[PDB]
Amino acid sequence: HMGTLEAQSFSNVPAGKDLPQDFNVIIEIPAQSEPVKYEADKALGLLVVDRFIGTGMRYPVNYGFIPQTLSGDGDPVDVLVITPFPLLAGSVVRARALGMLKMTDESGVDAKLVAVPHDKVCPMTANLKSIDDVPAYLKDQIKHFFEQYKALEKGKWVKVEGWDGIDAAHKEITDGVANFKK
Template identity: 30%
Template sequence: MPNFLKLPTTANALIRVVIETPRGAAAKLAYDPATQVFGYVRPLPVGMSYPYDWGFVPSTLGEDGDPLDGLVIHQAATAPGVIIKCHLLGALRVKQKDRDGKAIRNDRYIFCPHKEDAEDEPAVADQVPEHLRREIEQFFLSSVLGTGKTIKFKGWQCADEALRAIRKGMKAFAARGSSRIKG
């Protein structure tokens, strides 16, 4: 089985997202690189489920020490380990405070799948519609209940700004890998 963390981030100008928790799941799942399996982390609050596929962007590193997070907006549900080549729509900027009081930036990147069979790819909006932004924000606020974490939203980024942040995450991942080789 491949190490999903080390897959190339991009493919033909599209961004790969590795799905950890599929749409409709009532529990958070996560990839464990040590065992190379997807495992149960915790249940969501009662009555909640993931509205869309949730995962990470491979070969990236965020302030929390994990790969950058990604929500893939589409109507199908997949499964843990499915890799979707996506168009980047934007990002929700998030300040997260952990149980220990440490504050970090932990943005959520928003994607839509690339349609391989589309003859003429429709123009991809570089923004998430306002009503969907509010629903996504509400989901993220509710999803951290009982975890000891608090989150505050710092606004939305357009696709270009979000892409710059993903490139920064790619550089951080590469730097961490080279520092391990040297050290």
């Protein structure tokens, strides 16, 4: 939020080709990357060094956002995109939803969409139709990551509620696209 006195790239990427089923994700943090959190400055069209993760824990899945969306929290809709090889930071991928990881943090709701590329793009993930198809070990791994990664950030905490499905994820997209347009 910029104040009245002062206020006197990425933003041109569409949210999706066929929302909410077919959406675009701009990658911020590749899976397994060294433990540095980058957050897109949507104005500037650049990735910003946001935090050196105090726990040194790495994202177990790629992390990114859907451009032209605004979730309640002030963030765009944030997305975890599962792939067999980490994606390049700052790249864009066409995606479909598997579901939602429901969480809350010290500041409020903190839900993350779970997504994969389209089947034609990534045949390796074609077998994942919904959140329930994601391997148990990987869902547990993703949950534990969110619960623990900010553990050494003063003031901060994260609690996971559980998972929800495709309908829940489409609602987040729908709402986020609506919010961004006012």
